[PDB]
């Protein structure tokens, strides 16, 4: 029943020889026209969007809050003694901060020394290409005290009491707006309220909040947040090698050999949240320093 192999009419797999070339040639021409048409449509589509701005940005309204140790399940489990147990973390931290070294940001034609104190927003004109390549404000690793990179102590941040820096999701044209008068959650963590986006970490329930003893934050000039002098973003095309602000968080009195949950919530007016996306605005981590 499967002997369609051949026939006396020169059939192969079902049809003749002269028929295979006809069908194959038509499918080649037909599919070639289809491919050229799809490409022709996709080309005009490429002409629709611009190079300096995405035509839609509403799907990224509340910026996220990520961390340096991109854990498999946002959990940091290691041994304070075994160096290989925390190698997966340190490797990611070093590769992350590899573009923040003083030697990486050395060209003065593309870098601008913002300042040692968080200042107001720095708008570099419009988003068109009428101006040249915009300048990017520098951000040295020294700002993250005690969680610095390779300066004096390449501590690896793990000899007990680890470090976990947080980063604000880089959004084009986004201008962060810190909170004001209505403060039902703004704690007195730091005096600098107007030119820095505050971020406060805490437990999640009555148990985690007690297990986590003390948290020390580090930022630009010592403020737990992001300076407004580094925003807004002007895209990867106009601002290559851009360095978004960073802010480190260290948990000193932790309960070793105990998995505790931490929620780092970023506060602000332009910072939304979502009960479906635990990363929009807030940030979670499951730390367990098992000895």
């Amino acid at each position: 029943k499967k002997f369609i192999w051949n026939s006396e009419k020169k059939e192969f797999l079902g049809r003749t020889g002269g028929s295979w070339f006809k069908i194959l040639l038509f499918y080649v021409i037909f599919y070639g026209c289809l491919a050229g048409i799809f490409i022709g449509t996709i080309q005009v589509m490429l002409l629709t969007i611009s190079e300096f701005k995405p035509t839609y940005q509403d799907r990224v309204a509340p910026p996220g809050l990520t961390q340096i140790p991109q854990s498999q399940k946002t959990e940091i489990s290691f041994r304070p003694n075994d160096p290989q147990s925390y190698e997966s973390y340190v490797v990611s931290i070093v590769r992350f901060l590899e573009k923040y070294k003083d030697l990486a940001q050395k060209d003065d034609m593309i870098f601008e020394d913002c300042g040692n104190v968080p200042s107001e927003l720095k708008e570099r004109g419009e988003y068109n290409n009428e101006r040249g390549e915009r300048k990017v404000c520098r951000f040295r690793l020294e700002w993250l005290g005690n969680c610095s990179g390779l300066n004096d102590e390449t501590y690896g941040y793990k000899d007990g009491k680890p470090c976990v820096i947080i980063k604000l999701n880089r959004v084009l044209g986004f201008k962060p707006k810190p909170p004001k008068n209505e403060s039902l959650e703004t704690y007195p963590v730091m005096k600098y309220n107007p030119y820095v986006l505050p971020v406060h970490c805490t437990g999640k329930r009555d148990e985690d909040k007690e297990k986590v003893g003390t948290m020390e934050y580090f930022g630009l000039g010592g403020y737990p947040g992001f300076p407004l002098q580094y925003y807004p973003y002007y895209g990867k095309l106009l601002q290559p090698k851009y360095l978004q602000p960073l802010m480190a968080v260290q948990f000193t009195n932790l309960t070793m050999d105990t998995e505790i949950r931490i929620e780092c919530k970023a506060y602000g007016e332009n910072i939304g949240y979502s009960e479906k996306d635990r990363f929009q605005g807030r940030f979670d981590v499951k730390i367990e320093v098992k000895s």
């Binding site: 048409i37 589509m45 995405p54 990224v60 991109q70 999701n169 880089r170 990867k236 095309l237």
Partner: protein, 996 residues
């Protein structure tokens, strides 16, 4: 060993009828005049069983439910759901908190199978219920003589070997052996097929137990006369009982439409597994492990199965079957609605099916001119000429010299369909006078009868002297009728144009040629005459004789002849002509005498003018029949006596080299042989019968057609299609609807198969190029089981693109329902364009949100990760998991909408196979409703509050709806020029590849 029992029932029957009355009473032990003692009855009633056929086998309610639950198409969905559960188990044993996609798909496929089975069961059950509301048969008891006393007892209480007296009007209870009759003419229509009522004589006449007159049969009515007889067979042991049980033990076979559905499934699985295996090897060859490749393989095969096509095909066949039921063309088999369209040889029955099974006045002879009376059932034929006085004379002789009339309740019933007590000939005469000469009630009593003389065996005559009507003063009228050759001899005067003339041989032979003309035409002629007894030589008061005949037997005045025969049904001739127009070979299969069969065949269309038989040529050349060449004769009359001694090869030789064949005197068992011989050629056969002799023929055939009222219950149950109105034109309507739904099935199937390409391609390239998922699973369900349901259903209301009743019947081995051309169009050309449009919308949405098409290469790896919330786009922005996932879902929904957009043009192009959309016109109101409902449904599935949370189908930005518009317009334009080239260039390539 049932294979031998079936053959034993297939063999012709034998009997012991040819036995002396003493030998007959010796074999059974029964008195010839007193029957048997009442105690002897319980010795046979509780011995073999009551005199009643064993009720047919019962198939319980839930059996049909499971029959449709399994089927042939539902098996593909059952294996799909099984593969879904298997893939879900393989996917659950490897990942942590898994995804509910496959589980929902499996339960959905199971529900689809159950829903289809439920709908099919509901339709078939409704058919059987309305059929039960029409078979309210009431018991008919028998008149048995026991212990020398007459007693009327139930038919089931009758035993073997007890004297039974059948009166004129009673139905023959069981098979009897006539011992004393008085002119009993039983109606062997339902059993053997003899149209004219056959008289039953106690003396053995023919060796054949059927043709013999000393045997009464089950399910036969006693037209006239009375008779006595000993019970020979009872219950199932009867003739028709064995024929009925044989019908219950025959195989139904594989319907042509079901075979087409199976071939379609075979090709579907072919491409499904071909793409699954090829993509399995490719998936492994790139970077996926064996564990992931098996999941892929299953996904490709399952995604390549048309889920919604089952319900669409079911409702498709159901809609056409409903249109059949509206015209009283009920179908017990949901798929048998198409069987008529594929038929290429119709084997019909003559008595009851083609004819009305009612002796009717066909022609009359008066004033040396034949007058054809209308032979229609609804009285819509040409009216004869009734203006001369000879017509009134003939009408008086017929309406006066007649034994009986109608019955009690026969008052509101029409003149034709009303019952009449008496012989079949007298009833015809009565109806003709009641329809052409006013009434017979007041016409018979107005001429008071004095002395009537009934039919006689010696000196055969039937006369009666009546009184004279209104003042004319001849004082007497002696009417007589009989055989034309006998009435002509006892006649001297001849009525012509009103006056009288002598018996001159000139006009005397003009009657002989008319007699042979009406005899050769297949009718029963009868001569009528009257005479005015001169009251001047014979007293006006009381002057008659009955022992020493006084009325002048000779010197009578001949008026004319009156022929009669069972005429064919009104629409039968036109129906045969229409069937022969489409290329259907009409073959007559009856059990009537060849003399009547040839005439009926020439009158309905089975035998046209010009074609001569093997006997007609020999008669035209005055040479023996053994000399002419059978190849010179286009048509031929096959005698049933010669068919018994025929082999399987000779039957094929008769069917091949002869176009117009008429099988006469064929026993019920021989009809099955003829049906099998017609099926050996590989052609589709359809048997149309009414009596119990057509039960095995209507059962073995691909489709049986029974008469709603003129058909017996046995053949009505063994058949597959019931004609409630008995309108033979329903056959023409059925064949038209069968071919129409066949073409619409091709269209609907192509529409559902085209959507598979833009359904699987997103998941295919999702693995090939490692790009984010362009189309989800929930959306595909909203396509096959959502939007596209109505378009595939409305494609059933499409109408003929040309004259379907002009083309030849489809070839079962050549014209397939789903051939390779359909696959080359859906999976090859149209579906490909639909997939391109979907990918266009995909890149449009992603690139407009910052994720350019180039950047989408290899992004799936980190796109599906639930923890990498810093995915960088082409502009440098970082997206979280739920953010880019919301873009993916809002990219899946427009892909589904894109499918709808391209389905607009796909529905429009699949609506016509050869003609242009403008030549046919979109007059299908259901199709337009399908487009509006499909569009509105999709728009609702996207803009309904809570869809992004329930089905994760987020709203769409308006500018997305126009993304697939050019592609749809392209599909329409391309297929339009394709059909235009097939229209103007019906040659090769453009016809052998695209045309499906």
């Amino acid at each position: 060993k049932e294979r031998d029992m079936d053959e034993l029932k297939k063999e012709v029957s034998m009997d012991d009828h040819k036995l002396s009355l003493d030998e007959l009473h010796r074999k059974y032990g029964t008195d010839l005049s007193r029957g048997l003692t009442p105690a002897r009855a319980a010795e046979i009633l509780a011995r073999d069983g009551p005199n009643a056929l064993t009720p047919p086998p019962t198939t319980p309610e839930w059996v049909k439910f499971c029959r449709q639950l399994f089927g042939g198409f539902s098996m593909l969905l059952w294996i799909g759901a099984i593969l879904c559960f298997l893939a879900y188990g393989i996917q659950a044993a490897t990942e942590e908190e898994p995804q509910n996609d496959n589980l929902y798909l499996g339960v959905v496929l199971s529900a689809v199978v159950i829903i289809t089975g439920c709908f099919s069961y509901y339709q078939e059950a409704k058919s059987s219920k309305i059929m039960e509301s029409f078979k309210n048969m009431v018991p008919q008891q028998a008149l048995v003589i026991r212990n020398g006393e007459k007693m009327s007892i139930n038919a089931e209480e009758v035993v073997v070997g007890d004297l039974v007296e059948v009166k004129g009007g009673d139905r023959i209870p069981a098979d009897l052996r006539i011992i004393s009759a008085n002119g009993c003419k039983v109606d062997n229509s339902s059993l053997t097929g003899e149209s004219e009522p056959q008289t039953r004589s106690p003396d053995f006449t023919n060796e054949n137990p059927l043709e013999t007159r000393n045997i009464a049969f089950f399910s036969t009515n006693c037209v006239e006369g009375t008779a006595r007889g000993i019970v020979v067979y009872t219950g199932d042991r009867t003739v028709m009982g064995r024929i009925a049980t044989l019908a219950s033990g025959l195989e139904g076979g594989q319907t042509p439409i079901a075979a087409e559905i199976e071939h379609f499934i075979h090709i579907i699985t072919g491409v499904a597994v071909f793409l699954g295996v090829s993509f399995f090897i490719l998936s492994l060859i790139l970077e996926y492990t064996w564990l992931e490749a098996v999941i892929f393989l299953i996904g490709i095969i399952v995604a390549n199965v048309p889920e919604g096509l089952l319900a669409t095909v079911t409702v498709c066949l159901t809609l056409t079957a409903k249109r059949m039921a509206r015209k009283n063309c009920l179908v017990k088999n949901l798929e048998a609605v198409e069987t008529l369209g594929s038929t290429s040889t119709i084997c019909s029955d003559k008595t009851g099916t083609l004819t009305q099974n009612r002796m009717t006045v066909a022609h009359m002879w008066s004033d040396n001119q034949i007058h054809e009376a209308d032979t229609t059932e609804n009285q819509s034929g040409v009216s004869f000429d009734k203006t001369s006085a000879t017509w009134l004379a003939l009408s008086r002789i017929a309406g006066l010299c007649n034994r009986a009339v109608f019955q009690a309740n026969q008052e509101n019933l029409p003149i034709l369909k009303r019952a009449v007590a008496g012989d079949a000939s007298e009833s015809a005469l009565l109806k003709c006078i009641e329809l052409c000469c006013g009434s017979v009630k007041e016409m018979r009593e107005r001429y008071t009868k004095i002395v009537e003389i009934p039919f006689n065996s010696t000196n055969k005559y039937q006369l009666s002297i009546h009184k004279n009507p209104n003042t004319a003063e001849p004082r007497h009228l002696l009417v007589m009728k009989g055989a034309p050759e006998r009435i002509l001899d006892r006649c001297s005067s001849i009525l012509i144009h009103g006056k009288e003339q002598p018996l001159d041989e000139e006009l005397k032979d003009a009657f002989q040629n008319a007699y042979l003309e009406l005899g050769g035409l297949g009718e029963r002629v009868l001569g009528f005459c009257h005479l005015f007894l001169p009251d001047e030589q014979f007293p006006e008061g009381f002057q008659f004789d009955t022992d020493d005949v006084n009325f002048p037997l000779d010197n009578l005045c001949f008026v004319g002849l009156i022929s009669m025969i069972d005429p064919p049904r009104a629409a039968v001739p036109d129906a045969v002509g229409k069937c022969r127009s489409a290329g259907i070979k009409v073959i007559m299969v009856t059990g009537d005498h060849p003399i009547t069969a040839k005439a009926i065949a020439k009158g309905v269309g089975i035998i046209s003018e010009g074609n001569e038989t093997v006997e007609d040529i020999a008669a035209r050349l005055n040479i023996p029949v053994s000399q002419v060449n059978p190849r010179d004769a286009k048509a031929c009359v096959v005698h049933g006596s010669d068919l018994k001694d025929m082999t399987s090869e000779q039957l094929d030789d008769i069917l091949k080299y002869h176009t117009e064949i008429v099988f006469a005197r064929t026993s019920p068992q021989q009809k099955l042989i003829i049906v099998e011989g017609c099926q050996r050629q590989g052609a589709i056969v359809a048997v149309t019968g009414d009596g119990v002799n057509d039960s095995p023929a209507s059962k073995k055939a691909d489709i049986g057609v029974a008469m709603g009222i003129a058909g017996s219950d046995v053949s009505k149950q063994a058949a597959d299609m019931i004609l409630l109105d008995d309108n033979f034109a329903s056959i023409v309507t059925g064949v038209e609807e069968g071919r129409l739904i066949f073409d619409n099935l091709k269209k609907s199937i192509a529409y559902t198969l085209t959507s598979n390409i833009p359904e699987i391609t997103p998941f295919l390239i999702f693995i090939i190029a490692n790009i984010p998922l362009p189309l989800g699973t929930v959306t595909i369900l909203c396509i096959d089981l959502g939007t596209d349901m109505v378009p595939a259903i409305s494609l059933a209301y499409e109408q003929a693109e040309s004259d379907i009743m002009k083309r030849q019947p489809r070839n079962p081995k050549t014209d397939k329902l789903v051939n390779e051309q359909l696959i080359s169009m859906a999976y090859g050309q149209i579906g490909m364009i639909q997939a391109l449009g979907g990918f266009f919308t995909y890149f449009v949405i992603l690139a407009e949100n910052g994720f350019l098409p180039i950047h989408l290469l290899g992004l799936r790896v980190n796109w599906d990760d639930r923890w990498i919330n810093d995915v960088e786009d082409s502009y440098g922005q970082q997206w979280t998991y739920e953010q880019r996932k919301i873009v993916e879902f809002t990219c899946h929904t427009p892909f589904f909408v894109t499918i709808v957009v391209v389905q607009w043009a796909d529905l429009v192009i699949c609506k016509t196979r050869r003609n242009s959309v403008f030549q046919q016109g979109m007059k299908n109101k259901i199709l337009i409703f399908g487009l509006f409902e499909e569009t509105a449904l999709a728009a609702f599935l996207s803009y309904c509050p809570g869809m992004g949370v329930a089905l994760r189908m987020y709203p769409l930005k308006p500018t997305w709806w126009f993304c697939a518009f050019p592609y749809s317009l392209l599909i329409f334009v391309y297929d339009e020029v394709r059909k235009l080239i097939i229209r103007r260039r019906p040659g090769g390539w453009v016809e052998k590849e695209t045309y499906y």
